[PDB]
Structure 1
């Protein structure tokens, strides 16, 4: 998995690849690794897929209730604190490695979270099996005072480095931009550099090729009147 986060002038951008793997097999070619915690707080997840999904949903749910309780828009530090304390309690057994980002009344923020519940702050971050390939790109090309266009480019380039060089990462690039004083834009399949080529042959079989023993109608409808 390759997930990255990049700060810029007026906000923060996160990105991720779309490969899910079970051993050497690709389970899902177009997996969604960018999760919405609240409207303007999004996080990218690596590690165990059910855990990143579940831990995001739970904190996101509680963040929503908290926002309604306090009559305030949720803060990234709140999501960060709730996530880290949850993960720490389970001592790394919940395999969620998260890059948490967002904008709130305090400003724009970028954090990372590890499964054991340790947090880190940065202008650029990367996690997952392709984090070394991504971090190599970030360390070579990152600078202070990046624009929105430059940050998206840098973020997607870092993901691509993971896609191409890391076997655990592949397929497409998902991006989410969170700018201050604006709606967060979720760019699903921002890049698609891995479309499969046309097959040489069509394997549509002639009807009646398969041997059948019995047929029957299945009753899916309810018990009927009269």
Structure 2
């Protein structure tokens, strides 16, 4: 897994690859690793995937209720404080490693949070088994005052660093852009550089080829 977040002049973009692994096996060649906390606060997750989903949906739900109660738009600094205090409680047993990005009425934000409950702030970040490939690219091509289109390119490339160079990362690139005065823009499969080639054969069986002992139609409706 490789996830990154890059700040640009008017917002923030996060990106992730689409590969879920069980050991050395690829279970999903298109997993969505970009999660929604609120409409303009999004999350990339790495670690135990049940945990990254569990924790973003929980804090997601509490964030919604806080929002309805205070009649205010959700703040990133809140999803941060809530994530980190939940994680810290569980001493890292909740294996969620997270980059949280968003725009709110105070500006644009980018943080990373660790399973144990530590948080970091920066203009560019990465996590995952592709963390290193991605951060090499970011250390090479980042500058302040990125345009939107520049920050997409950058974040997009960094994921490609992990797709190619990291065994744990692969397949497609997912991006979400959240810009200060606009709707969060979510690009599922922004990049698909990994299409499987056409097989050398079709493996359709001639019907009747399987040996059957019993048939019986099944009762759906009571």
TM-score range, shorter chain: over 0.9
Following superposition, the deviation at residue 64 of structure 1 comes to 0.1
**How far has the Cα of 1:163 moved from its partner?**
0.2
Partner of 1:151: 151
Shift of residue 194, structure 1, vs aligned partner = 0.3
Cα distance between partner residues in 2 of 1:80 and 1:193: 33
Please name the residue that 1:212 is paired with: 212
Offset at 1:17?
0.2
TM-score, structure 2 length as denominator? 1.00
Q: Find runs of 4+ consecutive structure 1 residues off by over 4 angstroms.
A: none
Deviations 1:74-103 (A, max 9, x none): 000000000000000000011000000000
- Where do 1:79-94 residues align within 5 Å? 79-94=79-94
| Shift in Å, 1:154 | 0.1
- Displacement after TM superposition at 1:153 (Å): 0.2
2 CA distance for matches of 1:80 and 1:213? 58
Q: Give 1:43 deviation, angstroms.
A: 0.8
Offset of residue 66 of structure 1: 0.2
Tell me which residue corresponds to 2:139: 139
Distance 1:188 1:96 in 2: 22
CA deviation after TM superposition for structure 1 residue 151, in Å: 0.1
Residue 27 of structure 1 deviates from its aligned partner by 1.1
Whole-angstrom distance in 2 between the partners of 1:52 and 1:186: 19
Unaligned runs of 5+ in 2: none
The superposition leaves residues 123-144 of structure 1 with CA deviations (integer Å, 9 ceiling, x where unpaired) of 0000000010000000000000
The equivalences for 1:22-61 within 5 A come to: 22-61=22-61
Aligned counterparts, 1:50-199, within 5 A = 50-199=50-199
**How far off its partner does 1:120 sit?**
0.2
Specify every segment of 5 or more residues in structure 1 that has no aligned partner in the other structure, as ranges: none
Partners of 1:61 and 1:115 in 2: CA distance: 20
SS in 2 for 1:101: strand
Q: For this pair of structures, how many residues does the alignment match?
A: 222
Question: Shift of residue 116 of structure 1?
Answer: 0.3
Distance, in Å, in 2 between the alignment partners of 1:37 and 1:13 is 15
CA distance in 2, matches of 1:139, 1:77: 26
Aligned-residue CA RMSD in angstroms?
A: 0.3
**TM-score of the superposed pair, with normalisation by structure 1:** 0.98
Give 1:186 deviation, angstroms: 0.5
In 2, Cα distance between equivalents of 1:116 and 1:169? 23
